[PDB]
Write a protein that binds this ligand. Structure first.
Ligand SMILES: [Cl-]
Ligand SMILES: [Cl-]
Ligand SMILES: [Cl-]
Ligand code: NA
Length: 394
């Protein structure tokens, strides 16, 4: 590629920070440089990150010229296992820095992350890099190996499967296995440099458009009221306070079938609790200070689908126990805000007033001036299947 294509330029990092480009998520050059600079705070999440408005953290941070910008990492289908490898691949770039982790209760389904969701975001670069540089084996490495062998995208990689088998047996990758990954990494790193920007569509034009809606100076109460007025315009074609486009495209054509459709849904038991532990161990190993966010589900929608808000509180209690028990004490739990109007953009994605509330917690967290106690037993099936009614309220 032409030398003028500078993947680490200031403009490139700025443009990529709001793109949610999966090729950047699967790569190393761009995302690692952004986080290593200290100016970009990685936002680990999924599809909710794209719900932009005047009150999205990417817009508020640009409008008021803060000393940091979010770097959105995730999309639909990127859960904890994918993110654990994203975090690990940053290496020392994220060490001793700050991050934001947006949990989705919907991640914690009975069977965990679907095969196609993990496969669609599987990074051979990051996975091969992890195995090539492995010099000391940890329980987290063995848990990652065990989980990866369960997905078809990995099972078709025989050398990888053979290497993951040794990890589970307590052995480092064999010399011939490490050499193999190193051979391929020469191609994978070159392809990262050449192709990681294909399909990148920055949301900077949306940022600059929404900035024109915000006052010149920041005031939460003013913004909170303004978010209600703007939201009220964009949810007027239905009674569930759902965005017009989202509603007419996904809800309206099948509205009768969705009634009571979620009465039996349950997020209390899931392999995702183990995959989430994998991300927590990676963050703790690099001394990353993290703010965790738990969103609600719109009360007006859950009343129609039958999704249990009591069950969602059981899920929050389980997650906050796993966090607090191990030293993760920065938690913005908005799961009790289900009845807050204009909080969500649609059914499950944070919206106008939700992002404003998250933005305040993020901003306060970034101004805050680590005693982690990782417990490997959170990887075990008995925790994945643990009923949270016995847990305390941390
Ligand atoms: Cl501010
Ligand atoms: Cl819309
Ligand atoms: Cl309920
Ligand atoms: Na989500």
């Amino acid at each position: 590629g032409a030398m003028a294509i500078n993947l680490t330029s200031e403009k490139t990092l700025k443009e990529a920070s709001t793109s949610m480009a999966p090729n950047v998520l699967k790569g190393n050059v761009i995302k690692n440089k952004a986080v290593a600079s200290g100016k970009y705070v990685p936002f680990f999440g999924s599809s909710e990150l794209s719900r932009f408005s005047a009150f999205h953290p990417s817009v508020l941070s640009e409008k008021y010229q803060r000393n940091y910008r979010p770097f959105l990492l995730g999309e639909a289908g990127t859960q904890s296992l994918t993110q654990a490898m994203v975090i690990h691949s940053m290496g020392d770039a994220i060490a001793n820095k700050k991050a934001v982790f947006i949990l989705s209760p919907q991640w914690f389904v009975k069977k965990g992350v679907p095969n196609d969701s993990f496969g669609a975001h599987y990074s051979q670069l990051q996975t091969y890099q992890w195995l090539a540089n492995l010099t000391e084996l940890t329980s987290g490495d063995q848990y990652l190996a065990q989980r990866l062998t369960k997905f078809p995208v990995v099972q078709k990689d025989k050398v990888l499967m053979e290497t993951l088998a040794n990890l589970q047996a307590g052995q480092l990758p064999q010399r011939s296995q490490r050499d193999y990954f190193i051979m391929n990494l020469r191609f994978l790193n070159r392809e990262d440099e050449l192709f990681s920007q294909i399909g990148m569509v920055s949301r900077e034009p949306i940022v600059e458009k929404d900035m024109k809606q915000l006052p010149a100076t920041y005031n939460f109460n003013e913004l909170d009221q303004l978010a209600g007025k703007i939201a009220a315009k964009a949810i007027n074609n239905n009674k569930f306070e759902i965005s017009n486009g989202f509603y007419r495209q996904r809800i309206k054509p099948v509205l009768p079938k969705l009634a009571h459709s979620q009465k039996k849904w349950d997020y209390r038991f899931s392999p995702e609790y183990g995959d989430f532990q994998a991300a927590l161990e990676q963050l703790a190993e690099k001394n990353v200070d993290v703010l965790f966010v738990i969103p609600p589900v719109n009360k007006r929608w859950s009343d129609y689908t039958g999704l249990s808000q009591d069950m969602l509180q059981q899920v929050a209690r389980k997650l906050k126990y796993q966090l607090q028990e191990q030293g993760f004490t920065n938690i913005a739990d908005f799961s009790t805000c289900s009845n807050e109007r204009y909080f969500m953009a649609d059914t499950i994605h944070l919206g106008w007033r939700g992002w404003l509330a998250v933005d305040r917690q993020v901003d306060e967290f970034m101004k805050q001036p680590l005693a982690y106690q990782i417990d490997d037993r959170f990887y075990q099936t008995d925790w994945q299947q643990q009923n949270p009614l016995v847990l305390p309220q941390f």
